[PDB]
C-alpha cells in the first residue's frame with residue numbers, strides 16, 4: 001500500500017516545472033528545464049496514480065481508515081492537487097487532455113472537502129491534537145490549485161471564487177494551528193509536516209498572480225512579506241524539525257518552495273524586488289534539488305517504498 | 307414572552323425584499339414582489355416590536371437573563387438589525403422615517419455591542435461552550451447592516467467604518483468557532499443555528515457592494531468564493547442539522563440566503579458569473595419560500611408562539 | 613534593573629512627535645510641538661538605552677529570564693521599535709544617523725522574532741495562560757514600525773513586505789487572544805496591557821498610509837472602523853482595567869493612541885471623515901498628556917524607578 005503522502009513528490013516537481021516555464025521568454029533555456037521537470041513529475045504521478053488504484057482495489061480498508069481519520073484524510077487531497085498540476089504541465093502540449101485533468105482534479109477536490117472537511121463540524125472525532133499543518137492541503141492548497149488551473153483555461157472569475165475559498169480558509173485555520181503549535185509539542189513523527197506551514201502565503205500569491213495576469217500589486221507584496229517571515233521562522237526551526245534525522249517527509253516543504261520559485265518569476269518580470277526574487281528562485285531550486293538527491297539516495301538503498 | 311430569535315423572520319423577509327428591489331430596472335415586475343415582501347416584513351416587525359415592548363414591561367427579568375447570558379445575548383441584536391432593514395425598505399416611500407429607523411438601529415446596535423460584547427473580555431462568564439454561531443449577530447451582521455443602511459443615506463465613508471468593523475470582527479471570530487465546532491458536537495437544541503455560518507461572507511459582500519456602488523471587483527469575487535464553499539459544506543451537513551426534525555430555528559439560514567439573493571443581483575448587473583447569480587437568486591428564494599410555508603404550517607397548528 | 617516595559621514611554625512620545633510632524637504644512641506651529649516631543653522622546657530613549665546596557669552588563673541573568681519567558685520576552689521588542697521611531701524623528705535633522713538607527717532596529721526586531729517567536733512553535737513552554745496582548749509587540753508592532761521606517765528611507769516595496777508580515781501576523785494572533793480574554797479573566801497585575809489591544813488596527817493603518825503615500829482608500833477606512841470599534845470596547849472596559857488603581861502600565865495605551873493621532877492627520881489631509889479625525893487627534897493627545905502628567909507625578913514621589 002503506497003503511502004498517500006508520497007504524492008507530495010510529483011506535486012513539488014510539477015509546481016517547479018511550472019515556475020521554470022514562466023521564465024522561458026526571459027531565458028529560453030528555461031523551457032528545456034521546465035519540460036524535463038514536467039515529464040519527470042508526470043511520469044511519477046502516473047506511477048503513483050496506478051499504485052493508488054491498486055491500493056483502492058486490494059487495500060480498500062486502508063484507504064477507508066485514512067479517509068475517516070481526522071488527521072490522515074488530508075493527504076488524499078494531494079491526489080486531485082497533483083492531477084491539476086500535471087494538467088497544467090500538459091497544457092503546453094495538449095490543451096484538451098490538460099483541461100480534462102484540470103476539471104477532474106477540481107471537481108474531485110471540491111467534492112472531497114465538501115464531504116470530509118464539513119463532516120468535522122459534527123464534532124467528537126477531530127480532537128485538539130488533530131490540529132496539524134496537513135489540514136492546509138484540502139482546505140487551502142487544493143482551492144488555490146483549482147484557482148490557478150481554471151485561470152489557465154480562461155475561467156478567471158471562477159478562478160477568483162476558488163482563490164477566495166482558499167485564502168479565507170487559510171486565514172481562518174492558521175490562527176488555531178499556530179496556537180496549537182505554541183502549546184503542544186508536535187510529535188517528532190509528524191514534525192516534517194511543519195514544512196507545510198511555509199506553503200500558504202506562497203501558494204496564495206502564486207495563484208493570485210496566475211489569475212490577475214501577473215500584476216504584482218499591494219496584495220502580492222503583502223503576501224510575500226508574511227511568506228518570508230514564515231520562511232525565516234522555519235529556517236530557525238529546521239534543526240528541531242529534523243532532530244530525529246532527515247526523512248522523505250521533508251517533501252512537505254516542496255509545496256511552499258515551488259510556489260516561492262513560481263511567484264519569484266512574476267516579481268522578477270514585474271521588476272519588483274528583483275534581488276529577493278533571484279534569491280528566492282535559486283534557494284527554492286537548491287532545496288528541491290537536495291530533496292531529489294536525498295530521494296534518489298533512499299531509492300538507492302531500498303528505503304523508499306514501505 | 308416572545309422568543310427573541312423570532313426577529314430572524316422579519317430579518318430574512320426584509321433582506322429578501324431589498325434583493326428584489328435591486329432587480330426592478332432589469333425586470334419591472336420585481337418591484338411588486340419587493341413591495342409585497344417589504345410590507346409583510348414590516349408588518350411582522352411592528353408586531354414583534356410591540357410584543358418585545360410587552361416583554362420588557364411585564365417579563366423584564368426574562369430580558370435581563372437573556373441579556374446577561376454569554377450565549378443568548380446575541381439574539382437581541384436582531385432587534386436593531388431588523389429596525390435598520392425595515393428603514394431600508396421604507397426609504398422607497400418615506401426617506402425621513404427611514405432615516406430615523408436607520409439611526410436608531412445603528413446607535414442601538416453599536417451601544418449594544420459596546421456594552422455587552424466588550425464585557426465578555428472580563429473573563430469568567432463566557433465559556434468554551436459559549437462559542438456559538440449566534441455571536442455573529444451582534445459582532446458582524448449588525449455592523450454590516452449599519453454599513454449598508456448608512457450608504458443608502460449617502461454616508462459612504464461612515465459606512466466603510468462599520469463595514470470594516472464587521473469584516474475584521476468576522477475574520478477574528480470564525481477561526482475559534484470552526485475549531486470549536488470540529489472538537490465539540492453542537493447540541494441538537496442549538497444545531498439550527500449552524501445556518502448562521504452561511505451568513506458572514508454573503509452579508510459582507512452585500513454590504514460591500516452597497517457601499518462601493520455595486521462594483522463587482524476582486525474582493526467581491528473572493529467573498530463569494532468562500533461564501534459558496536460554506537454553502538456546500540452546510541448543504542452536506544443539512545441532514546445532520548435537522549437530525550431531530552425540522553423546526554422554526556431554521557430561519558437562521560435566512561440571513562445568508564437573503565444576502566446570497568441580494569449579492570446575486572449585483573453580480574448579475576455587473577455581468578460577472580451570471581449563471582451562478584441566477585442559481586443563487588432562485589435557490590435562495592425557493593429556500594426562504596420553504597421557510598415561509600413551514601412557518602404558515604406551524605401557525606396553522608398553534609405551534610408558533612410559545 | 614530597568615523594567616523593560618518602560619520603553620513604552622519613549623515609544624508613545626516618539627510616535628506622537630511624528631503625528632504632529634505630519635501636520636506642519638497645515639499648521640506651521642505643529643512643527644515646534646513635534647520637535648519638542650521628538651527631543652524629549654529621544655532624550656528618554658537615550659537614557660533607557662544606557663540603563664538597559666547597564667542591565668545587560670550587571671544584571672544579565674535578569675535579561676536572560678525575561679528573554680526565555682513566553683510572556684515577558686515580548687517587551688524586549690520595544691527596544692528596536694523605539695530605536696526605529698527615534699530614527700524617524702532624527703531624519704528631519706540628520707538622515708544618515710536616522711538611517712543607521714532604522715536599519716539597526718529593523719535587523720534587530722527581525723532577528724529577535726526569528727529567534728524567539730518561532731521557538732514558541734516547539735511547544736511545551738508557552739501555555740494557554742501566556743496568550744497576552746503583549747505578544748503584539750514583537751509579532752505585529754515591530755513589523756509595522758519597520759514598514760513605515762523603510763518607507764521613510766524610500767524602500768517602499770521592502771516596506772510592504774514588513775507591512776504584510778505585521779498585518780497577517782495580527783489577524784492570525786488576535787482570534788486566539790480575544791477567545792482567551794473571553795474565557796480567562798486576565799489577572800489585574802496584567803490588566804493595563806489590555807491597552808495594547810487598541811494598537812493593531814491603528815498601527816496598521818498608520819504604517820499603510822506611510823507606505824502608500826497617504827492615500828486614504830478602502831483598506832484604510834476598513835482598518836479605522838475596526839480600530840474605533842476596539843476603542844469603544846476598551847473605553848467601556850476602562851473602569852475594570854483600572855479596578856486596582858491607575859498605574860504606569862497604562863502607557864500600554866499610548867501605542868494605539870499615538871497611531872490614532874498619526875493616522876488622523878492623513879484622513880484629515882485626504883478630506884475623509886475630518887470630524888472624526890479632529891476628535892481622534894484631540895482625544896489621543898489629551899490621553900497621552902494625562903499619561904505624562906501621571907508620570908511626572910510618580911517621578912515626583914520616587915515611584916517611577918523600581
Ligand SMILES: CCCCCCCCO[C@@H]1O[C@H](CO)[C@@H](O)[C@H](O)[C@H]1O
Nearest residue numbers: 056060063064065067068076079112
Ligand atoms: C480516495 C477516496 C477514498 C474514499 C473512501 C470512502 C470511505 C467509505 O466510507 C464508508 O462508506 C460506507 C459505505 O460506502 C459506510 O458504511 C462506511 O461506514 C464508511 O466507512
Ligand SMILES: CCCCCCCCO[C@@H]1O[C@H](CO)[C@@H](O)[C@H](O)[C@H]1O
Nearest residue numbers: 076079080108109111112115116119
Ligand atoms: C480523490 C478524492 C475524491 C473524493 C472521494 C470521496 C468519496 C467519499 O465517500 C463517502 O464518504 C462520506 C463521508 O464523509 C459519505 O458520503 C459516505 O461515507 C461515502 O459514500
Ligand SMILES: CCCCCCCCO[C@@H]1O[C@H](CO)[C@@H](O)[C@H](O)[C@H]1O
Nearest residue numbers: 217218219222779780783829830831
Ligand atoms: C489579509 C490581507 C489582506 C490585504 C489586503 C490588501 C489590500 C489591497 O490593497 C489595495 O490594493 C490595490 C492594488 O495595489 C490598491 O490600489 C489599493 O489602493 C490597495 O488598498
Ligand SMILES: CCCCCCCCO[C@@H]1O[C@H](CO)[C@@H](O)[C@H](O)[C@H]1O
Nearest residue numbers: 023026261264265266268277278281
Ligand atoms: C525569478 C528570478 C529568475 C530571474 C533570474 C535572472 C537573473 C539574471 O541576472 C541579471 O541579468 C540581468 C539582465 O538580463 C542583469 O542586468 C542583472 O544585473 C543580472 O543580475
Ligand SMILES: CCCCCCCCO[C@@H]1O[C@H](CO)[C@@H](O)[C@H](O)[C@H]1O
Nearest residue numbers: 362366369370371373374382385418
Ligand atoms: C433590550 C435590552 C435589554 C437590556 C437589559 C439590561 C439588563 C440590566 O442589568 C442589570 O442592571 C442593573 C441595574 O440597572 C444591575 O444592578 C443588575 O445587576 C443588572 O442585572
Ligand SMILES: CCCCCCCCO[C@@H]1O[C@H](CO)[C@@H](O)[C@H](O)[C@H]1O
Nearest residue numbers: 382385386414415417418421422425
Ligand atoms: C436593543 C439594544 C439596545 C441596547 C440596550 C443595552 C442596555 C444595557 O444595560 C446595561 O447593562 C450593562 C451591562 O453590560 C451595564 O451598563 C448595566 O448593566 C446596564 O445599565
Ligand SMILES: CCCCCCCCO[C@@H]1O[C@H](CO)[C@@H](O)[C@H](O)[C@H]1O
Nearest residue numbers: 167168171217218219523524525528
Ligand atoms: C480576507 C480577504 C482579503 C482579500 C483582499 C482582496 C484584495 C483586493 O484586491 C485588490 O482589489 C482591487 C479591486 O479589484 C484590485 O485592483 C487590486 O489590484 C487587488 O489587489
Ligand SMILES: CCCCCCCCO[C@@H]1O[C@H](CO)[C@@H](O)[C@H](O)[C@H]1O
Nearest residue numbers: 329332567570571572574583584587
Ligand atoms: C440575480 C439574478 C436575477 C436575474 C435573472 C435574469 C434571468 C433572465 O434570463 C436571461 O434573460 C436574458 C435577457 O434578459 C437572456 O439573454 C438570457 O439567456 C436568460 O438567461
Ligand SMILES: CCCCCCCCO[C@@H]1O[C@H](CO)[C@@H](O)[C@H](O)[C@H]1O
Nearest residue numbers: 668672675676677679680688691724
Ligand atoms: C536583549 C536581548 C537579550 C538576549 C538574551 C539571550 C539569552 C541567552 O540564552 C542562553 O544562551 C546560552 C548560551 O549563550 C544558553 O546556554 C542558555 O541556556 C541560554 O539561556
Ligand SMILES: CCCCCCCCO[C@@H]1O[C@H](CO)[C@@H](O)[C@H](O)[C@H]1O
Nearest residue numbers: 688691692720721723724727728731
Ligand atoms: C534587541 C533584540 C535583538 C535580538 C537579540 C537576541 C539574541 C538571542 O540569543 C540567542 O537565544 C536563542 C534562543 O531563542 C538562541 O540562539 C540562543 O539561545 C542565543 O544565542
Ligand SMILES: CCCCCCCCO[C@@H]1O[C@H](CO)[C@@H](O)[C@H](O)[C@H]1O
Nearest residue numbers: 473474477523524525829830831834
Ligand atoms: C482583513 C481586511 C481586508 C480588507 C481588504 C480591503 C480590500 C481593499 O479593497 C480594494 O481597495 C481598492 C482601493 O480603494 C479598491 O479600488 C478596490 O476596488 C477595493 O476592493
Ligand SMILES: CCCCCCCCO[C@@H]1O[C@H](CO)[C@@H](O)[C@H](O)[C@H]1O
Nearest residue numbers: 635638873876877878880889890893
Ligand atoms: C488630524 C486633525 C488635525 C487637524 C485639525 C484642524 C482643525 C481646524 O479646524 C478647522 O479649520 C478649517 C480651516 O483651516 C475650518 O474650515 C474648519 O471649520 C475648522 O473645523
